[PDB]
Structure formats: structure tokens, C-alpha cells
Amino acid sequence: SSFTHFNEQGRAKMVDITHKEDTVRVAVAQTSVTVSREIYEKMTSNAIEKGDVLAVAQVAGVMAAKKTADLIPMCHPLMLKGVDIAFAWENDGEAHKLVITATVKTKGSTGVEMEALTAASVCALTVYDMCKALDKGMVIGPTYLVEKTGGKSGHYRRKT
Amino acid sequence: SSFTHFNEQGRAKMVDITHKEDTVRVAVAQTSVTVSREIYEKMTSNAIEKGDVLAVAQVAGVMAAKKTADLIPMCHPLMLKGVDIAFAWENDGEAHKLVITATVKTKGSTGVEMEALTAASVCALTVYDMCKALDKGMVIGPTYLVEKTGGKSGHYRRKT
Amino acid sequence: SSFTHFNEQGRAKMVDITHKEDTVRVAVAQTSVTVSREIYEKMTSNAIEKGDVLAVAQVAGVMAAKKTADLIPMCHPLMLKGVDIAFAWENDGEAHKLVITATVKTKGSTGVEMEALTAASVCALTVYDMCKALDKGMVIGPTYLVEKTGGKSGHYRRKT
Amino acid sequence: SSFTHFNEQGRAKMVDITHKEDTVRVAVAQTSVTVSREIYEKMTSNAIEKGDVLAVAQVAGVMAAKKTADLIPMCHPLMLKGVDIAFAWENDGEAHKLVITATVKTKGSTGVEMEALTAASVCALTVYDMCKALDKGMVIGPTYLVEKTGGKSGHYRRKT
Amino acid sequence: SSFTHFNEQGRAKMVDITHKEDTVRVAVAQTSVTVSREIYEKMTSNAIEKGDVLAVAQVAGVMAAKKTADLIPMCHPLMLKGVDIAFAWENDGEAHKLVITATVKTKGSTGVEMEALTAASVCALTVYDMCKALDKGMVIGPTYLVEKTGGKSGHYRRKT
Amino acid sequence: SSFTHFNEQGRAKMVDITHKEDTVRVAVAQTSVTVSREIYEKMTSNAIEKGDVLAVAQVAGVMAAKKTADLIPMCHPLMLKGVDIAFAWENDGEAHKLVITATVKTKGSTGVEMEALTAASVCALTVYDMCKALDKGMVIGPTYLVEKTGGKSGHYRRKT
């Protein structure tokens, strides 16, 4: 086993994928934002705050998926065919945990794990930006790959 | 207490900071990447792999700090005065944990918490991109604010 | 009277504003999207379509204000202090007309008319993108400046 | 009929077009800029002002077509195969009206209506930026789709 | 003497300029494009080719000045106050040489040498892009700083 | 022979390549940075300065290849399949000359000469940015195309 993102001189390169074949590739990444009770309360009630934080974070996440190659040095620029995000409130203890799941799809010679991970990361950062006025102690993550299909390494799926 | 990023119609807005005063503001954010033993071994030895993953991730993180306003919908575009990142290998158990700490500085009417958090997040994503060929099970985070100075809310510092 | 955006050789330049003074500047721009009855009905009822088109368009508009200098060749890159957008349904006849009003604020040596106009334009384009599946005949505009304050030319205000 | 840009949770998503087939797609959009007599005179005579406003606006429009996915939240990033813009002075009354027509072409599973509309919009905004020193009362639009070919909805063509 | 763009760990950082004072800074950079006789002939006659290559290259150069921080890893994002470019045909022998001179101005705690150099470089690349259909043998450069004012290192001026 | 980047009205357009066929295309560009003895000494010894300038410049160059269409007005946005850069110190006299060679690969209907040239140019500019603290007299270039394969004009190769 060995790195693929370094060249003959030990420096970063964008791996040549010219020969590889084009297949349907999908990647699912997950992260979360743990928040204070106050933040959870204001995000789940429209009694006073009618603003939708998730709608904004969703948009940021989708747009981030498209900006992945602009942010990750060696990532290839791809023609994403689809990007969607799903939210779910959970309770990792007594604290409220917003779980974020990003799914990215494409047709090409390279996976979209980075696009999914980046979409999830920026989605979380946006939730943080929209709620930080209430509390700066919010915690993002862990962030990880849930699964990916297509490509050489076949189907990947985090064990649970 | 209340959200600041929503307008009179319950939709997202970039808060007007015209009246606020310009002061020295700093923000420190932290995250990490937990990796397999193989990834740790190849990143800490130059015997075969001479490529520097941290050098690439560092560059990505600094550039991400500058792209923060392009990624986070309601963030103000700022003239960052400084951005630096520090790395440290730790052992959150028997697994190797790369700790990433991003520090951002500026002079203005709004904090740089998002710039620091974004810098740290993309730095981590880049480490993941550079090592994923070896293992897709890497875990990023938790990501959180360590401290921030300047501004209304005074000095913030996560308790440890 | 004469152009300011052309140089000694008759080609485009970014006008030097080094000597000018920094003052509070605001700009308000307006546009609209005329839509079919079906589009209006689905955007104003949550009975089936619960998606908020305006929330997405609002985010796009704010982000576009920040990208103004990236899109308009000779515009100066500014540290926007605030950006907000307001919506209102009107009836320019028997057809439904969504009126969009973008307000941009800053502190500097140049106005933000372009930022407001661009914010409004992209906000409208986003409404169009979100509803085009229903009808491609939507009409955007007219788009124009409502008013601007600060600067040499003093206070401007479109007569009505 | 129903929206396609919203997901199972009522939030924005980039529609999956993985299954669709790749065909030749074209889109033509139109807009205009109504200007004062003075602006028209200086743009149509090289006696004193030799700067070419249309050359600058043309460049901005083409570049905007490529930035469409960066500006419109749910638009797919495409490999545009061609982008061209045409100008024509008209007289919508006694006032001078610069008509702008943008044509975008590509080969893929999704239309380029947004790319054409965005190209036209930014082209107009650039004309406004280059002439605003003379008058801020310029009016942009209406902006609309003239026609599009390829895709499910077959050939579209605005009736005149 | 020592590098300023590396941190305590030997990796890239954006130097903190928080303490420095804000002064008027200017930078002038120069480059050129050596072309074949055919390219020179078509660029200097409107008999058949009426397209203005310099107008396009000028726009690209100005826009590149603004994108400098997006391209150069450790450059600070600045509020440029002015950007202009000048062209001149010369004869570095019997071959035609288009000389490009970019001038950038700002008010801040850091010079704009990179903005001027980048503006000149992209301006040249654009001339190349517009004429490559005629010949791929065009040569760009040398590219260098002509002079800079303001800052610690005082006034710099290349000896001739 | 004639320009391809101008339309029927003598203004810039992105040439339609819809009909052309997709083939493997490669482009190799070269440039250099001539530096003072002091700069060469600090870049080739780790005795004190352990920072790797080439690692940073390499990353900037690869990322610039992907940003080519954002910088060069009429360039088509492509799905680059590979980007690599190679360095070599030479002595164009008694002065030290860092030679930079960028290779870009893709599969499509248009060459990647601009991507290679842009990658090389920004790589050089980054070396300059990282070393300018030591000397502002560094000279970049000449920059030129070494060779390109695929496409109509067949195989191109600069004579030496």
C-alpha cells in the first residue's frame, strides 16, 4: 500500500485518472452539531424565531459539495449529478445532537468521498454560524464516511 | 437572547456591523483526524514516502480561512491579518490522533471564529484526502472553538 | 461628464479611490419575478410543497452580494458590513409579481450600488431556478437602483 | 406537476440526473439596459470616449456563464461547450434600449437555461457598472428565456 | 535575513500584520508576450479581425489582481483601491514583443507586489489564449517587479 | 488562418466545441524563477529554514490549473484528469534558476495548454511570494508551451 497523491519528487499531484473507466459513484458522509438546550429550543420552535437554520445550512452544504475541488488541493473537479442532505435530532446523552448526513452522486473515474465529507462539514459550520450568537460552545463532529459505491476498492461501509 | 442572522421576515441576513468599533480580534479552533496505525506510520517516516501531508493540509487550511465568506452564507468578508496552524500527534487511546489547531487574527467589527473553525475543518479534510488511499475509516473531529478575544461577548475560553 | 472606468489607452481599469474618504454608504436595489398562477400557488401554500423557495433565494442573494467583485470586472472588493433582502407579492395586473428588494451597507470610499443590484439579480435568478420545473416563462425584472447614500454624488433616489 | 429542487424533508437539493441521457442542449436568454441619451451617445461615438463598454460586458457575461453553479445554489456544475453574446440597440419608445442576447451550449443530462440567464444578467450589470458614472437611473430587463432545446420538456420557445 | 511565510513548525502561514500601520502602497509589475509576425499583424489591423485582444486581456488582468489571494496561498486578502494596465508594442530583435505593465494601489499594512505580478501574468496568459489559434510558440515573460512604494523596505526600484 | 475567440460582432466568445470528438489530451508548459544566491542557499539547506517552498508552490500550481477557466475569460471549464509539476535547479549563467515544468492531462474536445501554462505561472508566482522577503529582484520566466498532444493541430513540440 502507498500514497497516490505524491509525485516522483515527493510533492503533491492530482492523480491521473485518464485510463480508469466511468461508473456510477455514490458517497455518504455524516457529522453532527451538539448544542445547548437553548439552541435546540429555538431551532425547534417557531413561536418566536421563525428563521429556518436548517434551510440555510442545507444550501451551504450543497454549494460546498460543488466547491470541494476549490478547497481540497488535489481533488479532481467533477460534474456532480446529485447532492442531498438529511437532518435528524438525536440525544447523545442529555445534550441535543443534530445529525447531518450528506449524499453525493456522480458518473466518472473517481469517487466523491471528499465532496460528501466537505458538504457535511460546511453544513455543520453553517449551523454553528447561525446559532453562535446564542452559544459558542457548540461542538461539530465527529465527521466520517458512512459508505461509498463504485470504483476499484469496491463497496465501502463503516461497521456499526 | 435571540438569533442575529435572521431578518424581519424570518430569512437569513448578513448582520449590519456598521456602527460597531474596530478592535483586534483573535480566534483559535481545534479539530483532529484519528487514523489507522498504517497511516500514522507512513506520515511519520520518510524511509519510503517522502511526501509531506501536513505541508499540504496546512496550505489548504490557510486558504480555506480566506474562503470562509464564500462558504458560510452569512459571514462577512474580512481582511484577515494572520492565519497559522499547528499540528501535534496524540493518542486518544491506542489509536493515533492528529490534533490540528488553527489561529486567525484580524482588526475589525466582527470576530473570526468561523474563519478559524473553517480553516481547521478544511485542514482536516485535506489530511483525509491525502491519506484516504490507505484507509477510508479515518475520523475527523470533534471540531470546536478553543477561545476568542475582542468584541462584545468579551474573552471566551472553553473550559478544560 | 465622462466615463471613469476607462484608462489612458481606452481600456478598462479599476478606478483609483485611494484619496477619497471613508463614509457610511448604503444602496437599495429592486427587481421582481413575474410567475404563472401555478407557481404562485405552490409558493404560497404549504399543503403539499413545504420547501421554502424564498429562503434559498435569500441565501443566494446575500452570497452574490459578496461575489460582486468576482463577477463585475471593474468593481472594487469591499468589506460589506451588512446585506439584507425583503420580499413582497404584488399583482402587476392579473399576474403574480414577486418583488425583491436588496439593501447593502458598508463603510468606505466607494458606493455599493453594484452589490445591491447583483444581490437582487441573483436572488431573482434563484427563484427562477427553483420554480422553472413548473414553468419556463417566468420573467425577471425590471431591475433598478431605488436609492443610495454617501459619496460624492450625494443622496440618490429614484422618483416615483 | 411539482418542484424538483426540494428533498424529502422540504429543503433544497441538487436533483440527481445520473440516469438521464446526454444530449445536445442549447439555451437562449435575453435582457436589456435602458439608458439616458447621454449614455447612448457616449457608447456609440469614439470621438472622445474610445473605451468599448460592450467588449467588457461581453467578457463578464461569458465568465458569469461559467460561474453559474457558484451563484445558483442548486445548479449542477457543467462542462459548457460554448457561450456567445449578441448586442443590438433598440428604441423602446424614445429612450435607447441595449438588447442583450446570450446563447449557451453544452452536452449533458441537464439544460443550460440558468447559464444563459445568468450570462445575460451579469452582462447587463456590467454595462450598468461601466456607465453608472454618467447616470444611476439605468434600468435592466426584463430578463427572460427566449428558447431552449434538448431534454425532457422538448423544445421551448417564448411566443411573440 | 529570513523567511517570513513559515511558522514555528516549518510550514506555511499567513504572516500576522496586525501591528503594522496602514499606509499608501503601490506596486508596478511588467511582463510581455513575444509573438509571430502573423499574430502581430492581426492584432494591429482592423481590416479583417475587428476583435480587440488587448481589451479582453486588460479585463482578465484586473480581475486577476482581485483573485490574487485566492491563487497565492499565503497572500493576505486586500481591499484594492486601484488597478490599471498599460500595453506597448516593442521589438526585442526582429520579433514583435507586447509589453504589459500592471499598476496596483491600496491602503494597508502589506504591499501589493503579488497583485501586480499576478495581474500582469494573467493578462499575458489571456493574450496567449486569444491568439494561440494562430500560433502556440508565443513566449511569455520575463515577468518582474518594476517598483513598489510604502512599507518597511521603503521604495524599491529595479535598476535599468 | 484566423482568430477563433471572437464572434460575429468582433467581441469575445467561448468557441463552441460541441461537435468535436473527445480524445486524450496532454499539455506540458515550462517557466522558471531566477533568484539571488541567498534565496537559493536558504531554499536548498534545512540547517535553519526547514520550510519547504516547493511544496507550497506545487500545491498552488495544481490548484491554479483547476482555476484556469475562472481566470482566462474564454477558456472552457474542463474535468482535468491529472496535474503534476516538476522542479529542477539550473544555472542560466552564474545565477541560480529554478525550472518549473507543469503537465496537465484530460479527456475532451479541447486542449489543456492554458491549464498547463497557468499552473506553471502561479507555481512561479508562489515561489516569488514565499521568497520575496529576502529579495524582490527575482525574475519569472520566460514561460512557454513545451508540447501538447491530441486535437486537430496534432502533436506540437517546441524545437530545441
mmCIF file of C-alpha atoms in Angstrom, chain F residues 68-134:
data_model
loop_
_atom_site.group_PDB
_atom_site.id
_atom_site.type_symbol
_atom_site.label_atom_id
_atom_site.label_comp_id
_atom_site.label_asym_id
_atom_site.label_seq_id
_atom_site.Cartn_x
_atom_site.Cartn_y
_atom_site.Cartn_z
ATOM 1 C CA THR F 68 -7.812 28.316 -15.192
ATOM 2 C CA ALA F 69 -11.358 28.817 -16.522
ATOM 3 C CA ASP F 70 -12.077 31.268 -13.676
ATOM 4 C CA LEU F 71 -9.076 33.390 -14.722
ATOM 5 C CA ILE F 72 -8.884 33.124 -18.523
ATOM 6 C CA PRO F 73 -12.097 34.707 -19.936
ATOM 7 C CA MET F 74 -12.743 32.395 -22.895
ATOM 8 C CA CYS F 75 -11.367 29.097 -21.571
ATOM 9 C CA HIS F 76 -13.774 26.161 -21.314
ATOM 10 C CA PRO F 77 -14.319 24.595 -17.861
ATOM 11 C CA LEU F 78 -12.804 21.100 -18.022
ATOM 12 C CA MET F 79 -12.739 17.938 -15.922
ATOM 13 C CA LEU F 80 -8.961 17.680 -15.539
ATOM 14 C CA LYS F 81 -7.830 14.070 -15.148
ATOM 15 C CA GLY F 82 -4.344 14.846 -13.893
ATOM 16 C CA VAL F 83 -1.944 17.628 -12.948
ATOM 17 C CA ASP F 84 1.684 17.286 -11.904
ATOM 18 C CA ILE F 85 4.635 19.654 -11.557
ATOM 19 C CA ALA F 86 8.386 19.005 -11.567
ATOM 20 C CA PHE F 87 11.229 21.232 -10.338
ATOM 21 C CA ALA F 88 14.927 21.395 -11.198
ATOM 22 C CA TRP F 89 17.642 23.859 -10.236
ATOM 23 C CA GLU F 90 19.737 25.118 -13.141
ATOM 24 C CA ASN F 91 22.358 27.797 -13.708
ATOM 25 C CA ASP F 92 21.446 30.158 -16.546
ATOM 26 C CA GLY F 93 24.883 31.712 -16.089
ATOM 27 C CA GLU F 94 26.217 32.283 -12.603
ATOM 28 C CA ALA F 95 22.723 32.900 -11.232
ATOM 29 C CA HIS F 96 20.510 30.119 -9.877
ATOM 30 C CA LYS F 97 17.451 29.302 -11.986
ATOM 31 C CA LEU F 98 14.564 27.179 -10.645
ATOM 32 C CA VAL F 99 12.960 25.471 -13.638
ATOM 33 C CA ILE F 100 9.279 24.578 -13.291
ATOM 34 C CA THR F 101 7.523 22.081 -15.579
ATOM 35 C CA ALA F 102 3.759 21.565 -15.395
ATOM 36 C CA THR F 103 1.954 18.658 -17.052
ATOM 37 C CA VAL F 104 -1.840 18.590 -17.384
ATOM 38 C CA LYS F 105 -3.986 15.755 -18.754
ATOM 39 C CA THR F 106 -7.656 15.417 -19.661
ATOM 40 C CA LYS F 107 -10.176 13.693 -21.926
ATOM 41 C CA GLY F 108 -12.248 16.029 -24.060
ATOM 42 C CA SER F 109 -12.820 18.226 -27.094
ATOM 43 C CA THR F 110 -10.288 20.948 -26.261
ATOM 44 C CA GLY F 111 -6.612 21.128 -25.316
ATOM 45 C CA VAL F 112 -5.182 21.965 -21.907
ATOM 46 C CA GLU F 113 -2.388 24.316 -22.959
ATOM 47 C CA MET F 114 -3.841 27.148 -20.865
ATOM 48 C CA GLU F 115 -4.196 24.939 -17.788
ATOM 49 C CA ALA F 116 -0.525 23.921 -18.032
ATOM 50 C CA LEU F 117 0.656 27.491 -18.668
ATOM 51 C CA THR F 118 -1.465 28.842 -15.822
ATOM 52 C CA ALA F 119 -0.318 26.101 -13.435
ATOM 53 C CA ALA F 120 3.306 26.941 -14.225
ATOM 54 C CA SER F 121 2.737 30.712 -13.910
ATOM 55 C CA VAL F 122 1.059 30.547 -10.498
ATOM 56 C CA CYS F 123 3.595 27.995 -9.270
ATOM 57 C CA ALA F 124 6.319 30.539 -10.120
ATOM 58 C CA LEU F 125 4.386 33.420 -8.536
ATOM 59 C CA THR F 126 4.096 31.370 -5.346
ATOM 60 C CA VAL F 127 7.846 30.725 -5.205
ATOM 61 C CA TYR F 128 8.216 34.503 -5.579
ATOM 62 C CA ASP F 129 5.705 35.173 -2.791
ATOM 63 C CA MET F 130 7.469 32.772 -0.413
ATOM 64 C CA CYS F 131 10.925 34.263 -1.026
ATOM 65 C CA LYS F 132 10.245 37.958 -1.636
ATOM 66 C CA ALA F 133 11.031 38.773 2.000
ATOM 67 C CA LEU F 134 14.651 38.016 1.062
#
